[PDB]
């Protein structure tokens, strides 16, 4: 009757490498007890932004399904992860619906992500024909054209590559620091419980 | 120079003297604090790193403590061989930029 | 046998460019970063940049846009050049080694020091 076990939060939060913005990886958590106390240790002076659950009383609540989304974005752009925002990274790479019942965690990570030589391994899309529906992922790298002439796999004027590259460096101001973001989504009171913290009889 | 130090300090031999380095959350709150000593006419050297340990070839006479958002270097058993400036260093991340902010440098005198 | 050797310099003129080299020996050169610092006479200390022994570099905001410094793993020498000097930039310049990881340094070796004077 008791789910016991342990939720793999340490694997999600402390993974060696996180995905890029346009190819954010989704992970599912189930059949374990969630201890939302190690969370406060990571980014302790940084604030959890939760959107429908009080972060203090989150321990005593059972969730039907928990999904974790991880990526790496620039500093000042983190404010775009909130629901209802508009911008380049909130409309061309990753958008949240305006019904989001979850909580987002962000912390400056300019100790292992960025390098003095410059980190070009993180990419982001810049050009799209139209908007993207909430919680969508596109990896296709077909060349996007805005003029009249068709693009037969070419570059230059009036024909651009949709993927641009972040250029992270140590001695940059807050805003150009690589921020690692993990957002947790879970809905309430609509299905049998699968994951939650301590509970007795 | 976000780091704040007293420009001058003095003490009699055998007296415990404390040199403070008071910073903020960005520079002293998150990262380590390192204490270097510069004699006149010589390049700076290393005295204390990591708030606990010291390099080889350095006596255990100097002691370091860190509290809140500030640090202190106490020199128990002061002698005549401590006529040098003392600098505190800590990586600082700010809205404008980021780097190794240093201190003004305290000129320590022995009577 | 760890040291960071430099070369002396003489007076300059405003608007000119000055170049100094830091050479290492006795240890694996392509393993440790390099830090640059400047000390104005009768003043404190302030560092300039961090460098891979073979690669790029990063510079502080204050001393950006006018410093250029490359790598040369042939004689284990790293050169730095400052352009558009001014009479307030008269100082002593030091090069220091660092821990292989950096980002939390312990500047144990330091350079001899180059005196730079800018007067007309």
Residue numbers in the entry:
A (entry chain E): 330 to 530
B (entry chain L): 2 to 112
C (entry chain C): 1 to 120
Give sentences copied directly from the paper behind this entry.
Overall XGv289, XGv282 and XGv265 bind patches surrounding the right shoulder of RBD with various orientations, but in a manner similar to those observed for LY-CoV1404, BD-812 and REGN10987—antibodies that are known to generally neutralize most VOCs with high potency—but showing decreased, to varying degrees, binding and neutralizing activities against Omicron owing to the presence of new N440K and G446S mutations. Similarly, a large patch of hydrophobic interactions constructed by V445, G446, Y449 and P499 from the WT RBD and F33, L50, I51, Y59 and W103 from the HCDRs as well as extensive hydrophilic interactions facilitate tight binding between XGv289 and WT S. Substitution of G446S disrupts the hydrophobic microenvironment, substantially decreasing hydrophobic interactions between Omicron S and XGv289. Furthermore, mutations of N440K and Q498R, together with altered local conformation, also decrease hydrogen bonding formed by N439, K440, Y449, R498, T500 and Q506 from the Omicron RBD and D95, L98 from the light chain complementarity-determining regions (LCDRs) as well as Y59 and N62 from the HCDRs that would exist in the XGv289–WT S complex. Consistent with XGv289, the substitution of G446S alters the hydrophobic microenvironment generally established by RBD and a group of antibodies bound at the right shoulder, including XGv289 and XGv282, triggering a conformational shift on CDRs and disrupting antibody recognition.
Omicron (B.1.1.529), the most heavily mutated SARS-CoV-2 variant so far, is highly resistant to neutralizing antibodies, raising concerns about the effectiveness of antibody therapies and vaccines. Omicron is the most heavily mutated variant to emerge so far, with more than 30 mutations in its spike (S) protein, 15 of which occur in the receptor binding domain (RBD). To delineate the structural basis for antibody-mediated neutralization, we determined the cryo-electron microscopy (cryo-EM) structure of a prefusion-stabilized Omicron S trimer in complex with representative Fab fragments. The two highly potent antibodies against Omicron (XGv347 and XGv289, with IC50 values of 0.006 and 0.016 μg ml−1, respectively), one monoclonal antibody (XGv282 with IC50 of 0.268 μg ml−1) with intermediate neutralizing activities against Omicron, but high neutralizing activities against the other four VOCs, and a monoclonal antibody (XGv265 with IC50 of 7.479 μg ml−1) with more than 500-fold decreased neutralization against Omicron, but potent neutralization against four other VOCs were selected for structural investigations.
